[PDB]
Amino acid sequence: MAQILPIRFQEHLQLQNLGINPANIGFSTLTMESDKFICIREKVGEQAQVVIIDMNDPSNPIRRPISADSAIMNPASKVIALKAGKTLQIFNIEMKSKMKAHTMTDDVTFWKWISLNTVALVTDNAVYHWSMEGESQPVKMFDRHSSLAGCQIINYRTDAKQKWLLLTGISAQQNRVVGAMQLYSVDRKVSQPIEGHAASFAQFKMEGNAEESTLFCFAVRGQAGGKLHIIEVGTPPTGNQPFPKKAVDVFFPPEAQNDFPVAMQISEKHDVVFLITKYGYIHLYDLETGTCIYMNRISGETIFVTAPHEATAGIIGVNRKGQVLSVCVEEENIIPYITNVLQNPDLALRMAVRNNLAGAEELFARKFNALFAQGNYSEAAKVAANAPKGILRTPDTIRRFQSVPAQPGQTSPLLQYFGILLDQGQLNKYESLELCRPVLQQGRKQLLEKWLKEDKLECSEELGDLVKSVDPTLALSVYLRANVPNKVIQCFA
Amino acid sequence: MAQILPIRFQEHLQLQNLGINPANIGFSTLTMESDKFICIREKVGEQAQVVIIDMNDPSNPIRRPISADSAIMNPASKVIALKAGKTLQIFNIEMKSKMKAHTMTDDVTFWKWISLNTVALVTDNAVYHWSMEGESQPVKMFDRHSSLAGCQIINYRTDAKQKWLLLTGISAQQNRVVGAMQLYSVDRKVSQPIEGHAASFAQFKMEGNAEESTLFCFAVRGQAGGKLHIIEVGTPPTGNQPFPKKAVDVFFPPEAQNDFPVAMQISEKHDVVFLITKYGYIHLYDLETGTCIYMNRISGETIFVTAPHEATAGIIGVNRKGQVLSVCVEEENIIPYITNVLQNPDLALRMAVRNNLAGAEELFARKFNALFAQGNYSEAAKVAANAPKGILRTPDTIRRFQSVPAQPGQTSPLLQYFGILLDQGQLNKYESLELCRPVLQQGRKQLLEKWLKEDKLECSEELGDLVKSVDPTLALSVYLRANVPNK
Amino acid sequence: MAQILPIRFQEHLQLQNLGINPANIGFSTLTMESDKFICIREKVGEQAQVVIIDMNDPSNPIRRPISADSAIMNPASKVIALKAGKTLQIFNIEMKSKMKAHTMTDDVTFWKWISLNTVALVTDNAVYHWSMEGESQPVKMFDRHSSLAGCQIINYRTDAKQKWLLLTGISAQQNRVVGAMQLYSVDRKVSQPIEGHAASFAQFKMEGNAEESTLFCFAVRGQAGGKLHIIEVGTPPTGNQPFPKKAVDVFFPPEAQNDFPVAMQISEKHDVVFLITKYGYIHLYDLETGTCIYMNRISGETIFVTAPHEATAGIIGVNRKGQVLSVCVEEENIIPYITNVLQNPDLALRMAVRNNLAGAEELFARKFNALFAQGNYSEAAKVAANAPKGILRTPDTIRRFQSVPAQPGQTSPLLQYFGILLDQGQLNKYESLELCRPVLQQGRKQLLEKWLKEDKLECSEELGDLVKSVDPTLALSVYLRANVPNK
């Protein structure tokens, strides 16, 4: 079967161990706006309170009597947004002060922090955005599209720049839980309906572009089965190649009778899409190609709320038992898993270099060595310059390139390689020495002077000693940047 | 593949994020005597120090300049045992006082806390046990058997009662790593050699016995390949059926060229044996039958040290990258995984009831009605009394039992049932209302009292208003145990 | 003047910033039993309290209403000893419980923790020692000698082993303060009077002995003037050369009219005696020779209480303004200061090697090079094995020894050097390789096996590759020790 675990499945806390009534671990009584806090609304006895679990010391909840139709914590600060029917309030739990309130005209039918300081109020007819800053009041962003009329609103998301907003609701239409999404463009004041169950946006800088694309990923299970779509949203930064829209199907086994997507979070650190189904299944898809990397079942109960897990760049959620679960890529097993279990070494090397992950060292040496025969020193050096965890940025790799003669005409494979590196970035101690040694003989001061200024060489006492052999004056410069001891400077006395 | 994940796989820490030199993340510089601390010996600069990581706030190591050939922390307290060549020292990190020392005559060649307050010193010729308590000195327990001569000593274990001790060493044979264990009996002052790679002891109260057996499980990749053995050690408590020794083979895939067992820990909470191989593989075996439940690979690098993970009843270890990993049973997925992925409900139900594992309310709330719809109503009671999470401990059940076949000479199964629970512990509010009621219905305080003195009963206001018609002061107790208002 | 500053001078806390009445910053109201707490007795309003400053978070005193003629905290734990006239009490501030009390028969005229759990009660006639442990009661240790009759008792000290006890008092005799000390021998139940102002004991292992001497250092400014004396106390451990008693004068400038010693603390980490005078002056003396290293004035007000500063191995005290000051050796400046400012390079190299301090690297190479040139290869290797911070423990040194042509019968200067190292401790990766290579080429693991068991070699993948040949299991363990990837 599969033979290396590509993800980690962790259980950060078990809510009942905090003595939380399991009647209160649900959609309407439990919220998770970020991986920072969990907030439960409980009626202890005849009294109503709010239990706030700070995931950074979950062992110690914060309880407050607080009657509220709903409560949702800030994604990052001890600021809570309580809703009493139509009177919204934004209180500072931290210093018990009341930051700001507002009686809506109609009842907020779903709401949710969309950022460090803006709440999103979904009315029966419109979505607003309320900043927890100042005297400001709620600001309508758009009007609910009609495809979502009478829908149970389950989520609202935004792209990083809050220029594209997505609203989702589900219906039990004719014996299936059908999902309805409304994707509204802020800048182009337009709005369109998509059948979708779960989605998320992502910033993704394509190979060869200088700007991140803004992607919108969404999944659904329709008559034609479940599918996952990854499409760029809006107009590519000027000068960017566009991102080819993608579409992949998301499998459901027969046992997974009427399962359907329920949550999605994307790892910007690994460019992997995490999808959770109604019945507790989890899938990982490659964000750039939509390739399915892994599927399994982690929960039998439903994970009714989730959020990205910043520590691991994964996904964390809570299910009906009270388990606060999380899943993430095991950075040390995924490349090997794609190569050996997926038997997809091409996805593996891409994902590896793209994300600087390890496990494809043998494929990289292989690839370098291969290009070296063909004598494509230039392609060969691209590979050593970009392969992860500096696996080919070695002295031996310089000795390799140093060994092939400069036929009359073009540029040396070594100088070529050092070219790539100098572009790529900053060179080490060994590389700077090997780069400078010759040049220094060739009386080329100016050149090392620019490499220095443009800060491309990792100065060293040794690179300095070398230069002192040609420019004792140019030395001080490297030394003064090299972190040497006075003796080295006092010699210049 | 898996229609389900029966285990959790976690990372509790990433040592280099604590800026720990990865040259120091090894067998000889890193030790984990329990899941409570991790202790690294580092030479920062030209200076030597000890970094102590308290797993209960790993974010903040404790560093101290401390030259020591070796350092191992207490399994539970901030007491550290340092070794300078031949001079052992037991210092109190907590309040920086020196608790106790002792120059050994020969060099301790391996050592390790075997309990909250005893260190085990392994000499080239003998194993001693040193208590960190008092003026006492190291006390030889046995002499190294000869099969272990010239072996790299890799571990020393004990049974809970420290009546059985196990010493392990490995040797680079020709081109194989051969493990050599010495299983010494304390009470029966005898000692025997076993070829073993990894092992652990476990207390296990068999189905139908009143005492826990003491098992000794060990694994090896013999010329006969890998095998796992689970055997009882010593003489069964009196009245205990003996535990049938077991033997299962442990699989190694072809890719796992020359892998071999390296660590073992048993979950007493779930009766599952966790085995970790040299190449990063993990297996879970059923402790009572040796059945293999799960296998996978969690690490590419070697997990060179481990310990039971108390919080989860699993295993936690550290590998070469500095990852502090842990694996455990996902209590909510394992029964379903065995019944469905493993296809093995016999094991599943064994496991379920044996360990109070959820995941079988179905074929459980089934087995009952099974025997009811039969003529059997006393195995049905046992059945609806050991089913997990009180699943069938329902009134609808006692009811089913009250309307029980009233047939002469045969003990009443409602009362036979009321027996399992009685012999089990406290009866719930209701179960204790129908148990009692008739007794007092009879007008007997003699038994009511007894059960009460032993908390076998959860009182109510009912029982209150009940036991009252008989004698107050008894009811008062029952009424208080139940807690009612000033009227 | 000074080209370099040999000490650090720090302010740790301004007591008035903690809003402490400066009327209460005195001998009788402020106590400092260790650098761990400062304890002030204040009458806030009409109420009497005890302010306990935990130097590990001085920002937050602990206050308690507590009428007591006196209060002195434990040197290390939150245990306080309160004295109500004649009723001594030892309370646990931590968990507010009362640990132990005792009404003395006569009034304790001075008292003071002499250790983690013993208080010393000085009576008008006798000194006792009371352990804060158990039901035990105060235990007379001796009877005040008569030279100390009617003396203001200012201090009481002990040697580490509490076998020698010292009592000091002052009294004005006409114009000045005459210090009177009573040095009592516990073992030899004798006691003698010394004229002294301040003193302290120190454990000091002499060059060439295997046991630490117990020294007693004391200073005085009476009839011959100021002098400092360092003398061994008792009978040298068996096999120890005795410590030549020392005597140095302690200078007082003219402006320091009637100044006189007031406090002393010795750094065991640097073997430097810190002396504080009545008028705020500080002197540093070499403990072994009594050579005066440094003098200066740090306070104008009097530092009326002090204690050793563990963190820096210096001295910390409090003066009349409420400044909690401290002085210590600046480990990176002292050798250069002695060499260069004091111009005593011999003292500098000794102190440097003795106390393994940076700063004399060029003098050490020089010294090595010089002996090497002369052919004094054994002395040359002593120098490289003992020069501080591993300065000559380089491969070059090995290679310098490796240049010496052989000579039948004569043992190589290298093997000699490696001898010294192997005695002094363990060796690095290069030294272990150069030590083992030959031996190994003679397939004789019999040696390397002992060096290993001993922990004297620093393994490596290379030292391992060398061994793999000879013995496989020995390489397995050398690799295990040096710790290698799965290659």
Short mmCIF file of N, CA, C and O in Angstrom, two decimals, chain B residues 85-151:
data_model
loop_
_atom_site.label_atom_id
_atom_site.label_comp_id
_atom_site.label_asym_id
_atom_site.label_seq_id
_atom_site.Cartn_x
_atom_site.Cartn_y
_atom_site.Cartn_z
N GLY B 85 33.17 10.65 34.18
CA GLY B 85 34.05 9.50 34.13
C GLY B 85 33.67 8.32 35.03
O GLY B 85 33.22 7.26 34.54
N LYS B 86 33.87 8.47 36.33
CA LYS B 86 33.55 7.37 37.23
C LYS B 86 32.85 7.87 38.45
O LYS B 86 32.40 7.07 39.29
N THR B 87 32.77 9.19 38.54
CA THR B 87 32.10 9.82 39.66
C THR B 87 30.67 10.18 39.27
O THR B 87 30.45 11.11 38.50
N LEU B 88 29.71 9.43 39.80
CA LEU B 88 28.31 9.68 39.55
C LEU B 88 27.86 10.75 40.51
O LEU B 88 28.35 10.82 41.61
N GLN B 89 26.96 11.62 40.06
CA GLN B 89 26.43 12.72 40.86
C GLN B 89 24.94 12.86 40.53
O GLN B 89 24.54 12.70 39.37
N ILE B 90 24.13 13.12 41.55
CA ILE B 90 22.69 13.30 41.42
C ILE B 90 22.42 14.66 42.04
O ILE B 90 22.35 14.79 43.25
N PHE B 91 22.25 15.65 41.18
CA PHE B 91 22.04 17.05 41.51
C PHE B 91 20.60 17.52 41.35
O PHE B 91 19.80 17.01 40.57
N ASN B 92 20.24 18.51 42.16
CA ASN B 92 18.88 19.05 42.11
C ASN B 92 18.91 20.35 41.36
O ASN B 92 19.20 21.38 41.94
N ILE B 93 18.61 20.26 40.07
CA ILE B 93 18.57 21.33 39.07
C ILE B 93 17.70 22.45 39.62
O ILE B 93 18.10 23.63 39.61
N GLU B 94 16.53 22.01 40.09
CA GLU B 94 15.49 22.84 40.72
C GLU B 94 16.09 23.87 41.68
O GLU B 94 16.05 25.05 41.43
N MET B 95 16.65 23.39 42.79
CA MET B 95 17.25 24.26 43.78
C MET B 95 18.77 24.15 43.84
O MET B 95 19.38 24.25 44.90
N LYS B 96 19.38 23.94 42.69
CA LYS B 96 20.83 23.82 42.57
C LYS B 96 21.66 23.17 43.68
O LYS B 96 22.85 23.47 43.81
N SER B 97 21.06 22.27 44.45
CA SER B 97 21.81 21.60 45.51
C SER B 97 22.29 20.25 45.02
O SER B 97 21.67 19.67 44.16
N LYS B 98 23.39 19.76 45.58
CA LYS B 98 23.91 18.45 45.19
C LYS B 98 23.38 17.32 46.07
O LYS B 98 23.81 17.15 47.19
N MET B 99 22.48 16.54 45.54
CA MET B 99 21.87 15.47 46.28
C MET B 99 22.70 14.28 46.66
O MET B 99 22.45 13.71 47.71
N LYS B 100 23.67 13.86 45.87
CA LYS B 100 24.30 12.61 46.25
C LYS B 100 25.28 12.18 45.17
O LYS B 100 25.01 12.39 44.01
N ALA B 101 26.41 11.59 45.55
CA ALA B 101 27.39 11.18 44.57
C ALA B 101 28.00 9.83 44.94
O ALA B 101 27.64 9.25 45.97
N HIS B 102 28.93 9.34 44.10
CA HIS B 102 29.54 8.04 44.32
C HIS B 102 30.50 7.65 43.23
O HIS B 102 30.12 7.44 42.10
N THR B 103 31.77 7.54 43.55
CA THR B 103 32.72 7.14 42.54
C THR B 103 32.59 5.65 42.33
O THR B 103 32.77 4.88 43.23
N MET B 104 32.23 5.24 41.14
CA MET B 104 32.14 3.83 40.91
C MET B 104 33.57 3.30 40.84
O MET B 104 34.52 4.07 40.68
N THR B 105 33.73 1.98 40.97
CA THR B 105 35.05 1.35 40.93
C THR B 105 35.42 1.15 39.47
O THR B 105 36.57 1.33 39.06
N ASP B 106 34.42 0.77 38.67
CA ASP B 106 34.64 0.57 37.26
C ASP B 106 33.75 1.60 36.61
O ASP B 106 32.84 2.11 37.28
N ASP B 107 33.98 1.89 35.33
CA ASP B 107 33.18 2.91 34.64
C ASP B 107 31.78 2.48 34.27
O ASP B 107 31.60 1.40 33.69
N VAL B 108 30.79 3.32 34.56
CA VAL B 108 29.44 2.96 34.20
C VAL B 108 29.38 3.06 32.69
O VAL B 108 29.60 4.09 32.10
N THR B 109 29.07 1.95 32.08
CA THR B 109 29.04 1.90 30.65
C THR B 109 27.71 2.23 29.93
O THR B 109 27.66 2.27 28.69
N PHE B 110 26.65 2.49 30.71
CA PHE B 110 25.32 2.80 30.25
C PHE B 110 24.55 2.97 31.52
O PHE B 110 24.83 2.29 32.45
N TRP B 111 23.61 3.89 31.61
CA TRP B 111 22.84 4.03 32.83
C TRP B 111 21.47 4.59 32.47
O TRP B 111 21.22 4.88 31.34
N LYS B 112 20.55 4.75 33.42
CA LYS B 112 19.26 5.19 33.01
C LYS B 112 18.27 5.07 34.14
O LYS B 112 18.19 4.04 34.76
N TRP B 113 17.48 6.10 34.38
CA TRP B 113 16.48 6.06 35.41
C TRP B 113 15.48 4.98 35.13
O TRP B 113 14.93 4.97 34.06
N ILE B 114 15.22 4.09 36.08
CA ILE B 114 14.27 3.00 35.86
C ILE B 114 13.08 3.30 36.73
O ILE B 114 12.13 2.49 36.86
N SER B 115 13.14 4.46 37.36
CA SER B 115 11.99 4.86 38.14
C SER B 115 12.16 6.23 38.71
O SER B 115 13.24 6.84 38.58
N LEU B 116 11.08 6.69 39.35
CA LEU B 116 11.02 8.01 39.95
C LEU B 116 12.20 8.30 40.82
O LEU B 116 12.49 9.46 41.08
N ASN B 117 12.90 7.28 41.32
CA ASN B 117 14.08 7.61 42.14
C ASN B 117 15.22 6.65 42.19
O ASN B 117 15.99 6.71 43.12
N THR B 118 15.36 5.80 41.16
CA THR B 118 16.44 4.83 41.09
C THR B 118 17.08 4.89 39.72
O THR B 118 16.37 4.85 38.70
N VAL B 119 18.40 4.95 39.71
CA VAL B 119 19.22 4.94 38.50
C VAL B 119 19.74 3.48 38.32
O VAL B 119 19.88 2.77 39.29
N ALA B 120 19.96 3.02 37.09
CA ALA B 120 20.47 1.68 36.85
C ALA B 120 21.85 1.93 36.27
O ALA B 120 21.95 2.66 35.29
N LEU B 121 22.91 1.39 36.88
CA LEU B 121 24.28 1.59 36.34
C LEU B 121 24.72 0.28 35.70
O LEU B 121 24.63 -0.77 36.30
N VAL B 122 25.17 0.34 34.47
CA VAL B 122 25.59 -0.84 33.81
C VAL B 122 27.04 -0.72 33.63
O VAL B 122 27.56 0.17 32.99
N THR B 123 27.71 -1.67 34.26
CA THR B 123 29.16 -1.80 34.30
C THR B 123 29.53 -2.85 33.25
O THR B 123 28.68 -3.61 32.70
N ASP B 124 30.80 -2.87 32.94
CA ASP B 124 31.29 -3.81 31.98
C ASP B 124 31.00 -5.25 32.43
O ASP B 124 30.97 -6.15 31.63
N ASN B 125 30.78 -5.45 33.73
CA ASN B 125 30.51 -6.76 34.32
C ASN B 125 29.20 -6.88 35.09
O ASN B 125 28.69 -8.00 35.26
N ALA B 126 28.65 -5.76 35.57
CA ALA B 126 27.39 -5.86 36.32
C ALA B 126 26.47 -4.65 36.27
O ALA B 126 26.90 -3.54 36.06
N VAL B 127 25.22 -4.93 36.53
CA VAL B 127 24.17 -3.96 36.62
C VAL B 127 23.86 -3.71 38.12
O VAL B 127 23.64 -4.68 38.87
N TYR B 128 23.82 -2.44 38.54
CA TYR B 128 23.49 -2.05 39.92
C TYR B 128 22.26 -1.15 39.87
O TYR B 128 21.83 -0.74 38.82
N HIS B 129 21.64 -0.86 40.99
CA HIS B 129 20.52 0.06 41.01
C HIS B 129 20.88 1.02 42.14
O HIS B 129 21.20 0.54 43.25
N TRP B 130 20.89 2.34 41.86
CA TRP B 130 21.23 3.36 42.86
C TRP B 130 19.98 4.19 43.18
O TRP B 130 19.34 4.73 42.30
N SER B 131 19.57 4.24 44.43
CA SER B 131 18.42 5.05 44.76
C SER B 131 18.93 6.46 45.04
O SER B 131 19.95 6.64 45.68
N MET B 132 18.21 7.45 44.51
CA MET B 132 18.56 8.85 44.74
C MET B 132 18.14 9.21 46.17
O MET B 132 18.32 10.33 46.60
N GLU B 133 17.61 8.25 46.91
CA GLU B 133 17.23 8.49 48.28
C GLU B 133 18.32 8.15 49.30
O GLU B 133 19.04 7.16 49.16
N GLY B 134 18.46 8.99 50.31
CA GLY B 134 19.41 8.74 51.39
C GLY B 134 20.91 8.61 51.19
O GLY B 134 21.48 9.08 50.17
N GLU B 135 21.56 7.97 52.17
CA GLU B 135 23.01 7.78 52.16
C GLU B 135 23.40 6.50 51.46
O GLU B 135 24.56 6.24 51.20
N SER B 136 22.41 5.70 51.13
CA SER B 136 22.61 4.45 50.40
C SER B 136 23.64 4.50 49.29
O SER B 136 24.02 5.55 48.79
N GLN B 137 24.10 3.33 48.87
CA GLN B 137 25.07 3.27 47.76
C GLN B 137 24.54 2.34 46.67
O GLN B 137 23.50 1.68 46.85
N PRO B 138 25.24 2.27 45.52
CA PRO B 138 24.79 1.42 44.41
C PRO B 138 24.71 -0.02 44.83
O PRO B 138 25.63 -0.50 45.44
N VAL B 139 23.65 -0.73 44.48
CA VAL B 139 23.48 -2.13 44.89
C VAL B 139 23.41 -3.17 43.77
O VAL B 139 22.34 -3.35 43.17
N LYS B 140 24.50 -3.90 43.52
CA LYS B 140 24.52 -4.90 42.45
C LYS B 140 23.29 -5.79 42.42
O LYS B 140 22.89 -6.29 43.45
N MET B 141 22.70 -5.96 41.25
CA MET B 141 21.48 -6.73 41.13
C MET B 141 21.77 -8.03 40.44
O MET B 141 21.03 -9.03 40.65
N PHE B 142 22.76 -7.99 39.55
CA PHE B 142 23.19 -9.16 38.84
C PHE B 142 24.45 -8.90 38.07
O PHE B 142 24.95 -7.78 38.07
N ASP B 143 25.00 -9.97 37.48
CA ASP B 143 26.27 -9.89 36.77
C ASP B 143 25.94 -10.13 35.35
O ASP B 143 25.16 -11.01 35.00
N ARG B 144 26.55 -9.32 34.51
CA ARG B 144 26.29 -9.43 33.09
C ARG B 144 26.51 -10.84 32.61
O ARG B 144 27.52 -11.46 32.90
N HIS B 145 25.55 -11.34 31.87
CA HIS B 145 25.69 -12.67 31.28
C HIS B 145 26.74 -12.57 30.17
O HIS B 145 27.03 -11.49 29.68
N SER B 146 27.33 -13.68 29.77
CA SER B 146 28.41 -13.64 28.79
C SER B 146 28.04 -13.45 27.33
O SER B 146 28.90 -13.11 26.51
N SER B 147 26.78 -13.70 27.00
CA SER B 147 26.32 -13.55 25.65
C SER B 147 26.39 -12.10 25.20
O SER B 147 26.38 -11.80 24.00
N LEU B 148 26.45 -11.22 26.19
CA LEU B 148 26.52 -9.79 26.00
C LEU B 148 27.95 -9.27 26.14
O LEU B 148 28.14 -8.07 26.39
N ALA B 149 28.96 -10.11 25.99
CA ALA B 149 30.31 -9.62 26.15
C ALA B 149 30.70 -8.85 24.90
O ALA B 149 30.48 -9.32 23.77
N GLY B 150 31.26 -7.66 25.09
CA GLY B 150 31.65 -6.84 23.95
C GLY B 150 30.49 -6.25 23.14
O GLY B 150 30.66 -5.87 21.99
N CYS B 151 29.31 -6.18 23.75
CA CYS B 151 28.13 -5.64 23.11
C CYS B 151 27.99 -4.18 23.42
O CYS B 151 28.40 -3.73 24.47
#
